[PDB]
């Protein structure tokens, strides 16, 4: 029983790598990163999880990301401190040329998308869990390859463009707050393309079916619910399980703190209705800007001018945290709110 830790990028190529890897590994935890700070955070998370595991065989798999020399050095050095740990990086970005030729585990091929590199590496070394799936999995891989390298003649090119936009626009589950549910959703949507690959007009057929499919994958009923209520309902349900970690206290009022969620009017109104014990909702983004909402039980205009140099209305307001310190660790973000609220 070998434990796989799979870190990948966030676009179609990045998530398709993880569709592929889940076809091979019964014991796998996935991670995603966009830019460099997030990549380092995920590498720390992965090494931390491996240090705390009780298993003995491990594979660190990194796809569709390039590391700078310092992060590649850190990875190599860290796994030789105080367990059998294999590492394989698969990528196609020419920016990593120098780093690739300094590490035997760092593999660069600029002529293929990362998903195809992952597939051929895993297929050479591991049995696919369900050998019937190959008849749709290899076409799906090739489709991703064709659009990623923009081969207008390659198999599945036009359908792949639909899938690329699908991945970009399936943002109904905030990635920071709901990392696993965000990945499951996108991967469910991408896998459903297997029911279109062999249609005569696959690109258009999938393109026109996707919206209804998204509503269903989010747990909604597309015949009686709008997308904006399906998305906010799916998110609030996931937020309701986080009440103890995300609770913050301003004077005598209790609030719920989220991060990077953006436009929160529908979301917060629904959360506060379903959870009447909360007085306000507060979301912060990476630049320190703050959105506050209430349902009559907390003047968030007064709150944000006491705490965030801001203003608005009794039930909706904004502001900013000067010197706010971005992070991919939710506790780090919460401590910053707590410190502000503590003197309030
Ligand atoms: Cl969280
Ligand atoms: Cl809870």
Tell me how crowded residue 340 is: count the other CB atoms within 10 A of its CB: 17
Considering just the CA atoms, what is the radius of gyration of the chain in Å?
22
Which among 110, 78, 76 is positioned nearest to 93, based on CA atoms? 110
**Any idea what the CATH number is for the domain that residue 323 is in?**
3.10.310.30
Buried b or exposed e, range 182-207, using 16+ CB within 10 angstroms: bbebbbbbbbbbeebbeeeebbeebb
Q: Are 60 and 76 in contact (CB under 8 A)?
A: no
* 3-class secondary structure per residue, 198-245: CCCCHHHHHHHHHHHHHHHHCCCCCCCCCHHHHHHHHHHHHHHCCCCC
Task: Show the domain range for 307.
Answer: 237-343
Look up residue 112 and give its two tokens: 């293929």
CA of 327 to the centre of ligand 2 (A): 23
- Structure resolution in Å? 2.2
Beta strands in 33-129 (DSSP E): 57-63, 84-91, 106-108
Q: Are 59 and 3 in contact (CB under 8 A)?
A: yes
Q: How far apart are CA 151 and CA 143, in angstroms?
A: 10
Give the environment of ion ligand 2: residues with CB less than 5 A.
243-244
CA of 232 to the centre of ligand 1 (A): 16
Experimental method: X-ray
Q: How far apart are CA 83 and CA 75, in angstroms?
A: 15
Q: Are 256 and 282 in contact (CB under 8 A)?
A: yes
Look up residue 273 and give its two tokens: 């209705």
Buried b or exposed e, range 219-250, using 16+ CB within 10 angstroms: ebeeeeeeeeebbbbbbbebbeeeeeebebeb
Q: Which long-range contacts (CB under 8 A, 24 or more apart) does 30-35 make?
A: 30/6, 30/180, 30/183, 31/5, 31/6, 31/7, 32/7, 32/8, 32/175, 32/179, 32/183, 33/7, 33/8, 33/9, 33/65, 34/9, 34/10
CA of 239 to the centre of ligand 2 (A): 8
Tell me how crowded residue 269 is: count the other CB atoms within 10 A of its CB: 18
Q: How far apart are CA 97 and CA 118, in angstroms?
A: 18
Q: How far apart are CA 77 and CA 71, in angstroms?
A: 10
CA of 178 to the centre of ligand 1 (A): 7
Opening angle at CA 174, ends 139 and 295, nearest 5: 150
């Amino acid at each position: 029983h070998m434990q796989v830790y799979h870190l990948s990028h966030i676009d179609l190529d990045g998530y398709a790598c993880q569709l592929v890897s889940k076809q091979f590994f019964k014991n796998i935890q996935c991670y995603n990163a966009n830019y460099g700070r997030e990549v380092s955070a995920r590498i720390y998370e992965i090494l931390n999880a491996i240090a705390q595991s009780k298993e003995s065989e491990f594979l660190i798999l990194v796809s569709d990301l390039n590391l700078n020399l310092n992060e590649a050095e850190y990875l190599q050095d860290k796994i030789q401190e105080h367990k059998n740990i294999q590492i394989q990086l698969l990528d196609h970005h020419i920016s990593g040329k120098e780093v690739a030729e300094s590490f035997h585990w760092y593999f660069l091929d600029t002529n293929r998308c990362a998903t195809k590199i992952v597939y051929e590496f895993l297929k050479k070394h591991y049995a696919i869990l369900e050998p019937k799936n190959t008849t749709w999995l290899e076409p799906l891989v090739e489709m991703v390859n064709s659009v990623d390298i923009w081969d207008t003649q390659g198999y599945g090119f036009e359908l792949g463009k639909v899938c690329m936009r699908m991945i970009t626009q399936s943002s109904e589950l905030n990635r920071f707050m709901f990392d696993d549910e965000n990945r499951d959703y996108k991967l469910k949507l991408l896998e459903e393309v297997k029911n279109y690959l062999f249609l005569e007009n696959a690109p258009v057929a999938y393109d026109n079916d996707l919206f209804r499919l998204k509503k269903i994958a989010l747990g909604g009923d597309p015949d009686t619910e709008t997308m904006d209520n399906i998305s906010s309902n799916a998110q609030t349900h996931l937020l309701s399980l986080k009440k103890h970690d995300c609770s913050v206290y301003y004077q005598d009022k209790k609030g719920f703190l989220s991060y990077s969620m953006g436009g929160i009017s529908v979301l917060a109104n629904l959360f506060l209705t379903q959870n009447p014990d909360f007085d306000f909702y507060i979301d912060v983004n990476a630049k320190g800007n703050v959105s506050l909402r209430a349902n009559g039980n907390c003047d968030v205009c007064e709150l944000s001018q006491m705490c965030f140099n801001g203003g608005g209305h009794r039930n909706a307001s904004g502001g900013k945290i000067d010197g706010f310190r971005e992070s991919f660790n939710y506790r780090d973000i919460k401590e910053q709110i707590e410190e502000i609220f503590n003197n309030a």
